[PDB]
């Protein structure tokens, strides 16, 4: 899509207008100022030309002999030092053209971005809350920063770079019909192949950044969801299974990136023959030409450098364009969102803002559908009221319309039909900030932003005294433990900061709910995740809150509910019955069956990595050697042409020996692509068996390491698809295309030197003090070619963290009503890199604008001095010529090849990390072999007094002298409070972890001496969630037994076991559905059961139920209860128990507090003990 | 198509300074060096001298150092002698010729003009 | 400086037959590398000379067909088969090191035969 072009600087202004017309002035200004250098260069060539050939005329001047000939050079003197005013004029004009073409370019793009990205950020903070939801916000995170630095590069810099090759092209094009009319004709039809040539090879020489990511893209899934289900696989084994796909697809990628390879290489090689050949008969038809007396020698060399680097600037603008449309694409995404007219704000200014508010609400005739799907209707018919300050609880079926209430009275959606008021007031005609400031939610799970405590309760409201802070943490009961915390109110939480419970993060969201000082509350299942001794504090918080106000309560489990003063039961978005907790109970309806049913580099390592193929490396160095020193040859032949046009002889061997010249041109030509060809061939192979055998073998021993090492924040699912991806990438270029450059620059400046010393002597010591200026030359152009040294990004990414932090929070933020801090917060740590980005613009133009003009100052200084040494007959002009070209050259070939091959720096630490993780040995090696692994069947289960710490966080305890054995086939069960360490039982009969003290015996034989492979392969472990891969349900049941051959009949009976049979014989292509995101979506108890059967193929002797909170399926739920109780009938089994009617009957109960066991026994046992778990049952009452 | 033009006859008295021109027509004018010739009646062929054509570079003979100068013009495509001290015994035709500057010494000379009669008288 | 000695002064010939001329130098025009340099040329009476025979045996393009040379070290002769009503003028001949002089030769006119 497009924009269009006209859009693009839609938010251009005032002046920054003016930097562009001046900018576009400097650029064609500056391109301009090439080739008519070249041109005084053939006439300074026609000059030395003229003057040698005269004086190599007449020699026998005898006697009175010395006098006219130094006159001659006399004349050469003056008429040489004439043209040293002109090239350092030129010097002067293109260093401050230079200057103020690359700032005013670069300065507007930085005043442009800066307004687009603030009101980027303006216009997505500023949105419909259904426009969620629906887009997914983790693409929505990475686009405003990765899209908006996509248009930065595509906006500012580029096109002035464009704009100068357009005047250099149409400069060197006029400047060569006007000195030259038949051989422009000639190089312009040669022009269009050579145009192409360097046209597509720059295409190729700027990246190779991510093009290789492009193909990879099928083991990146693969593996990004095996990384994100490590839990679901080291429980059951499959390390082989998985691995042996991933092998798969990373050996036909390996062959597509051989034949790309190959395919990039024929086409540079042939870009080489192209040029060559193009040199080969231009100088063979200007020879022809000059011969017969037509031109002279400054106009060939002045015509055909000129249209030549006219070619090569129309060849180095492909990319500048292609970027721009690209940037185009990226526009239309922006200015989409950026242009659009959300209906619902909620930020303008346009409703009544009723004060002394009462908080009388009423529903009237209420039809509400998501914006997902209009078809099937959530509410119908809704009509309800709430008097002022009362308490009303809504109750009924899950998913049928009570979350919709929360929903819509902070109109976060528009009701299709009838009316939601306030105070007889339609809500749609009072200002929604207004509104959603008079009202505070408590979400069902509690966020927290990633800053102190303080700046967490005054997004509360930002203009918050810090006494006011103490009064609300005090009201919400919150206050006790955080005393107790390290640094008091100045404790950084988040997902940076410590790690707080559930029940804590809940209380600090009142608390922001309560310093707004709402006239009504909104409770969306404020306590769902919460255990039942974290919920006792927070109801008698919420209690405290709703004192005084209006609230409306959407929440499961209708316990406390029974104080409320009304309550109402919905059925398909109806509220049928209403009334007060003994009259529904004595309605016998709804409400009451729910009631009832409660109750360092090292280099020599980095190259020793690739000990197993070094033949190739061999070759390819012998043919690196090859091509270095063969590009002082062109320079060599160069001089002896342009030389033996400077002397005088018989025509015919002038004629001979210029074709002779001509031809070795196009041999040469050959020998570069062949070579050329089998090098890049040979070290492009290398490189990619290095990073398919690296890559392979990394992912190996990532399988192989333990639980542990997936708990520190720095290894998640991103940053280790992301390590091992982009790792690679960089480790491939250490040792694949280093040692090619590098002899190549040797080789090549080396000769230069050698054969410069043999013929000159003098100017060599005066040029090797001009080298490094010019060295440095050739980088920093590239660099400014490429944008590479743009991209440092370290304050953007110090800021994009309250970015992220804001936006994928949205529902608490938008219903906190903070929009102003955070674009106040957004401007600061943005106005830093815009100063910075100031000064890196005007010293990145100084600097390359004085290595432009010190190349052109040196130039004439060296052609002066070149002058004198031929003034006193000690040096032909052929010589310096000849050392001019092979050092000039050589500093030129070191720049454009220095900066083509990768870095250093990330390399080598990229190759630092390969090794570290590499050699990095698992604790518990589960690819080990070895281990007792017998042949008892039975399942006796025994922890004795173990001991634990999660090594993430090994100053709290979890573990602590626990005990319990589990007889074969009965039922243990685990509960308790949180912090208690119930789910650790389960990852430490797996051996996710060993524990510090005490032993773990199965069948009386410590697990720590058998094969953990076995130990797991006899465990059925069925997670909280259950992961299933993308792909069919029979493979995704198969993963459970690895390493057998499954046939046909072997699936259908464990998926009858799992009670999923009958559904999924109704399904479209029975068990052939593929199930991802591509495929059908089928509901959480539904994938419940999916890994049920998963662990009933294996026949496990020992199953692990680790399930919980919450539920609300009312239909899948009991089905999966069913599977459940059918498998646990003949088999040892461990309960992670929180519900509490799947615990009655079980065999026996442990309840476990601070890692002890405070008191075990079966239902009836401990429900006459009257003790911990008799006060859990007694709450669902 | 070459061609190179001279003036018309010439009648000078004694002592007095004349100039003579030779136009080119017809090729690269910034190439060739220009030789100038004598000839006298019943004699050989002299040789006054050469200029460069591109930048005045000059030569001359020794039997003519003094009795002549070069001048080009570029912009009209011109070479002109200027001939001061002139005496009795320079009665004769005078011829321009062309050479190639690229490869001299080894060349011929290509083109020539129709020549110049030059009388003196007192 | 190489005076040059030519032969013979003033020749007969009828129509349409052959007729030699000899130039003879007195230093060698042999240069060091393999080559003897002469230029024969035409002059007809009021216009302008033209050139002939160049490098002694090479021709020059756009003349006719008629015209020979041959010689070598120190003795040259140029030989005219089938005489026209055309070529009636003075040939003269030229020399090959340069300062000083760089001279010529004389010349030779052409009678009838009567």
């Known amino acids: 899509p497009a924009v269009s072009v006209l859009t693009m600087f839609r938010y251009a202004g005032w002046l920054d207008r003016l930097y562009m017309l001046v900018g576009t002035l400097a650029a064609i200004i500056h391109g301009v100022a090439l080739p008519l250098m070249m041109l005084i260069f053939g006439e300074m060539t026609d000059i030395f030309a003229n003057a040698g050939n005269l004086e190599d005329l007449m020699s026998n001047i005898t006697n009175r002999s010395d006098i006219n000939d130094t006159g001659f050079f006399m004349n050469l003197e003056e008429d040489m030092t004439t043209y040293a005013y002109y090239y350092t004029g030129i010097g002067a004009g293109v260093l401050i053209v230079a200057y103020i073409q690359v700032s005013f370019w670069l300065l507007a793009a930085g005043r442009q971005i800066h307004k687009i990205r603030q009101k980027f950020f303006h216009a997505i903070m500023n949105q419909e809350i259904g426009w969620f939801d629906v887009h997914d916000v983790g693409e929505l995170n990475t686009r405003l920063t990765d899209d908006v630095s996509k248009i930065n590069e595509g906006i500012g810099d580029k096109i002035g770079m464009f704009f100068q090759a357009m005047a250099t092209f149409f400069g060197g094009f006029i400047i060569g019909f006007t000195r030259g009319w038949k051989l422009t004709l000639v190089i312009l039809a040669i022009s269009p192949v050579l145009g192409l040539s360097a046209g597509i090879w720059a295409k190729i020489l700027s990246s190779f950044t991510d093009k290789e990511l492009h193909a990879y893209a099928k083991a990146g899934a693969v593996a990004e969801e095996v990384l994100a289900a490590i839990r679901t696989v080291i429980a059951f084994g499959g390390q082989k299974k998985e691995l042996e796909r991933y092998n798969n697809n990373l050996e036909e990628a390996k062959r597509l990136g051989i034949k790309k390879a190959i395919t990039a290489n024929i086409s540079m090689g042939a870009a080489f023959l192209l040029i060559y050949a193009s040199y080969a008969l231009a100088f063979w038809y200007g020879t022809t030409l000059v011969l017969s007396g037509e031109y002279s020698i400054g106009q060939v060399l002045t015509v055909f450098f000129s249209v030549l680097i006219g070619a090569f600037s129309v060849g180095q603008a492909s990319p500048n364009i292609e970027a721009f449309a690209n940037a185009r694409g990226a526009a239309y995404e922006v200015f989409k969102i950026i242009d659009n007219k959300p209906s619902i704000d909620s930020f303008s200014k346009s409703g009544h803002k009723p004060d002394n508010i009462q908080g009388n609400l009423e529903f009237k005739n209420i039809h509400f559908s998501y914006p997902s799907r209009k078809e099937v209707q959530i509410l119908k018919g809704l009509n309800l009221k709430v008097k002022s300050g009362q308490t009303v609880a809504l109750v009924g079926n899950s998913g049928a319309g009570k979350s919709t209430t929360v929903q819509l009275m902070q109109r976060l959606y528009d009701p299709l039909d009838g009316m939601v008021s306030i105070d007889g007031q339609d809500i749609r005609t009072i200002n929604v900030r207004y509104l959603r400031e008079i009202i505070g939610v408590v979400s069902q799970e509690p966020v927290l932003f990633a800053t102190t405590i303080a700046e967490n309760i005054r997004y509360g409201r930002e203009d918050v005294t810090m006494d006011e802070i103490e009064k609300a943490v005090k009201e919400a009961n919150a206050y006790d433990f955080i005393m107790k915390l390290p640094h008091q109110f100045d404790t950084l939480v988040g997902e940076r900061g410590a790690q707080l419970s559930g029940g804590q993060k809940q209380r600090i969201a009142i608390a922001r709910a309560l310093v707004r000082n709402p006239k009504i509350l909104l409770l969306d299942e404020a306590t769902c995740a919460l255990d039942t001794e974290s919920e006792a504090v927070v109801q008698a918080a919420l209690d405290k809150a709703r004192e005084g106000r209006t609230t409306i309560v959407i929440a499961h489990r209708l316990s406390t509910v029974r104080n409320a003063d009304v309550i109402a039961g919905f059925d398909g978005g109806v509220i049928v019955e209403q009334g007060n907790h003994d009259e529904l109970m004595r309605e016998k309806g709804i409400y009451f069956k729910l009631v009832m049913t409660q109750t360092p580099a090292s280099f020599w390592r980095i190259l020793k990595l690739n000990s197993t193929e070094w033949p190739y490396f061999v070759v390819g160095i012998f043919v690196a050697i090859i091509n270095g020193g063969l590009q002082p040859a062109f320079s060599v032949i160069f001089s002896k042409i342009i030389g033996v046009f400077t002397r005088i002889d018989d025509p015919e061997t002038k004629r001979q020996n210029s074709n002779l010249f001509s031809l070795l041109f196009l041999i040469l030509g050959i020998i570069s692509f062949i070579t050329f060809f089998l090098q890049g061939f040979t070290f492009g192979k290398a490189g990619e068996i290095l990073t398919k055998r690296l890559r392979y073998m990394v992912f190996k021993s990532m399988l192989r390491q333990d639980v542990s090492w997936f708990d520190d924040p720095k290894n998640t699912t991103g940053a280790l698809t992301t390590r091992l991806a982009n790792d690679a990438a960089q480790v491939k270029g250490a040792t694949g295309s280093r040692l090619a450059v590098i002899f190549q620059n040797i080789a090549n400046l080396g000769t230069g030197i050698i054969i410069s010393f043999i013929y000159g002597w003098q100017l060599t010591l005066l040029l090797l003090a001009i080298v490094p200026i010019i060295a440095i030359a050739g980088v920093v152009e590239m660099k400014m070619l490429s944008g590479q040294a743009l991209k440092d990004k370290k304050e953007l990414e110090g800021s994009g963290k309250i970015a992220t932090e804001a936006i994928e929070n949205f529902r608490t933020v938008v219903s906190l009503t903070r929009e102003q801090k955070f674009e106040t917060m957004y401007a600061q740590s943005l106005q830093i890199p815009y100063r910075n980005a100031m000064k890196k613009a005007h010293v990145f133009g100084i600097t390359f604008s004085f290595t432009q003009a010190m190349m052109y100052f040196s130039y004439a200084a060296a052609f002066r001095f070149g002058a004198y040494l031929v003034a006193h007959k000690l040096m032909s002009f052929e010589d310096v010529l000849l050392v001019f070209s092979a050092i000039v050259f050589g500093a030129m070939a070191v720049g454009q090849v220095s900066s083509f091959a990768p870095d250093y720096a990330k390399a080598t630490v990229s190759a630092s990390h390969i090794i570290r993780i590499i050699e990095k040995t698992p604790e518990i090696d589960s690819y080990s072999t070895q281990g007792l692994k017998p042949n008892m069947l039975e399942g006796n289960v025994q922890f004795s007094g173990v001991v634990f710490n999660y090594p993430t966080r090994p100053s709290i305890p979890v573990l602590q002298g626990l005990s319990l054995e589990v007889k074969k086939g009965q039922t243990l069960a685990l509960v308790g409070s949180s912090g208690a360490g119930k789910s650790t039982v389960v990852q430490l009969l797996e051996r996710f972890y060993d524990p510090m003290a005490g032993s773990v015996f199965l069948d009386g034989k410590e697990i720590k001496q058998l094969n953990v492979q076995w130990l797991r392969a006899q465990l059925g472990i069925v997670s909280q969630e259950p992961i299933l891969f993308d792909t069919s349900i029979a493979e995704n049941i198969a993963y459970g037994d690895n390493s057998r051959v499954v046939s046909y009949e072997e699936i259908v009976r464990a998926a009858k076991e799992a009670n999923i049979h009958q559904f999924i014989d109704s399904l479209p292509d029975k068990y052939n559905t593929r199930v991802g995101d591509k495929g059908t979506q089928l509901s959480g108890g539904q994938k419940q059961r999916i890994a049920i059967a998963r662990a009933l193929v294996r026949q496990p002797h020992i199953l692990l139920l680790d399930e919980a909170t919450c539920a609300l399926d009312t239909e899948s739920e009991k089905v999966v209860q069913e599977a459940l109780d059918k498998a646990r009938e003949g088999r040892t089994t461990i309960v992670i128990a929180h519900r509490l009617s799947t615990i009655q009957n079980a065999d026996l109960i442990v309840v476990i507090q601070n890692g002890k066991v405070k008191e075990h026994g079966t239902h009836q046992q401990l429900l006459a003990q009257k003790g911990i778990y008799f006060s859990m049952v007694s709450v669902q009452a | 198509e070459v061609q190179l033009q001279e003036s018309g006859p010439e009648l000078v008295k004694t002592g007095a300074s004349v100039k003579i021109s030779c136009k080119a027509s017809?090729?690269?004018?910034?190439?060739?060096?220009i030789h100038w010739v004598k000839q006298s009646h019943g004699k050989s062929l002299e040789w006054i001298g050469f200029?460069?054509?591109?930048?005045?570079?000059?030569f001359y003979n020794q039997k003519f150092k003094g009795k002549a100068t070069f001048t080009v013009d570029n912009s009209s495509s011109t070479a002109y002698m200027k001939f001061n001290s002139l005496t009795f015994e320079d009665s004769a035709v005078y011829y321009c010729?062309?050479?190639?500057?690229?490869?001299?010494?080894?060349?011929?000379?290509?083109?020539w003009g129709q020549g110049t009669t030059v009388t003196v008288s007192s | 400086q190489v005076v040059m000695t030519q032969s013979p002064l003033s020749l007969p010939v009828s129509l349409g037959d052959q007729a030699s001329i000899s130039c003879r130098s007195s230093?060698?025009?042999?240069?060091?590398?393999?080559?003897?340099?002469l230029h024969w040329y035409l002059q007809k009476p009021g216009q302008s000379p033209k050139l002939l025979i160049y490098?002694?045996?090479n021709r020059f393009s756009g003349v006719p067909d008629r015209f020979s040379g041959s010689g070598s070290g120190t003795d040259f002769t140029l030989k005219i088969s089938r005489v026209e009503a055309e070529d009636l003028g003075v040939y003269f001949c030229?020399?090959?090191?340069?300062?000083?002089?760089?001279?010529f030769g004389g010349g030779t006119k052409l009678d009838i035969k009567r």
């Open positions: 017809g090729y690269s004018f910034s190439n060739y060096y």
């Open positions: 490098k002694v045996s």
């Open positions: 230093q060698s025009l042999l240069h060091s590398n393999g080559n003897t340099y």
């Open positions: 010729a062309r050479l190639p500057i690229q490869f001299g010494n080894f060349y011929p000379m290509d083109y």
């Open positions: 200029i460069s054509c591109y930048n005045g570079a000059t």
């Open positions: 030229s020399q090959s090191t340069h300062i000083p002089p760089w001279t």
